[PDB]
């Protein structure tokens, strides 16, 4: 019974995050969006945050220890367990992390400040999220299709 | 619209962009929405200039909230492309934020410029 209650709670949470901010939900998903709303406190308090802050939401301990010890700061926070950065690996994962943080900041500002005439579909409300998602996936597939270094093909002799 | 402290006078826009170019040469400037946000939150920003030709205005409408909370003047110039090649970027910047220091002719210019922004208000 507890597990079935958890499952229907997650369905409710997805419905509610879709109702609140469709741009962030079309970008990453209601779960990680809910995590970001939790760590910020409020939707307006999150919309007041810049892109780098949304990148390193959740990694605050490692961030401030590395900054106070002159170490290298952590690359990402909850954006890792977001979906779209999961397709990459290593440096492309870091670059997708920056780009997804910036577009998430854009989409959360749009979802928390744009006004609509209320006879507006969820599609024309989440147009910014859909466009950002498509463009970001194109950038990801490009970084994945970056070619390796060409090398001199040596024959049997060494020529 | 929501761009109520708008700067429409072309002499005022020319003065603002000349001041932005000068501060950019002095590296007393922060370019872009996210660096504007960070500078205003840390409270160092002496004046902040937004661009009205952003196609979703909501991607910059958050800055006046913290600006009212921190009592720093903000003003809307028309063209993001004008603001861009005034900063010296060749990309369309939408929110620039120019700070203050201990002593400079640019500090005196910033005082006069925020006086003119208060006139605009």
């Amino acid at each position: 019974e507890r597990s079935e209650y958890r499952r229907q709670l997650a369905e409710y949470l997805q419905n509610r995050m879709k109702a609140i901010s469709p741009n962030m939900t079309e970008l990453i998903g209601a779960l990680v969006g809910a995590r970001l709303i939790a760590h910020s406190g409020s939707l307006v308090n999150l919309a007041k945050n810049p892109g780098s802050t949304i990148q390193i939401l959740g990694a605050e301990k490692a961030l401030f220890r590395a900054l106070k010890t002159k170490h290298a700061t952590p690359k990402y926070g909850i954006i890792y367990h977001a979906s779209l950065v999961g397709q990459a690996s290593g440096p492309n994962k870091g670059k997708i992390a920056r780009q997804l943080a910036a577009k998430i900041a854009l989409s959360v500002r749009t979802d928390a400040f744009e006004d609509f005439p209320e006879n507006a579909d969820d599609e024309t409300r989440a147009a910014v999220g859909i466009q950002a998602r498509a463009k970001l996936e194109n950038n990801l597939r490009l970084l994945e299709g970056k070619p390796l270094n060409k090398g001199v093909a040596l024959g049997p002799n060494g020529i | 619209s929501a761009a109520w402290p708008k700067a429409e006078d072309p002499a005022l826009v020319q003065e603002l962009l000349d001041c932005v170019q000068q501060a950019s040469h002095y590296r007393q400037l922060k370019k872009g929405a996210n660096e504007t946000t960070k500078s205003v939150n840390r409270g160092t920003s002496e004046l902040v200039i937004l661009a009205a030709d952003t196609q979703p205005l909501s991607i910059v409408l958050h800055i006046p909230l913290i600006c009212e909370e921190k009592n720093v003047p903000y003003v809307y110039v028309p063209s993001k492309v004008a603001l861009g090649r005034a900063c010296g970027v060749s990309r369309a910047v939408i929110a620039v934020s120019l700070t203050s220091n201990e002593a400079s002719d640019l500090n005196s210019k910033i005082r006069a410029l925020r006086d003119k922004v208060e006139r605009l208000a």
Binding site: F64, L67, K68, K70, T73 | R42, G43
Partner: peptide, 30 residues
């Protein structure tokens, strides 16, 4: 730069708190 920025943020919060407490301790009215 990052380390100096963090120390400046801390010092700014402390200066705000101290100026507030100092004012709270200690032709104006007509």
């Amino acid at each position: 730069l990052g380390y100096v920025r963090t120390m400046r943020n801390i010092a700014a919060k402390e200066l705000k708190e101290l100026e507030e407490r100092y004012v709270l301790a200690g032709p104006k009215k007509i």
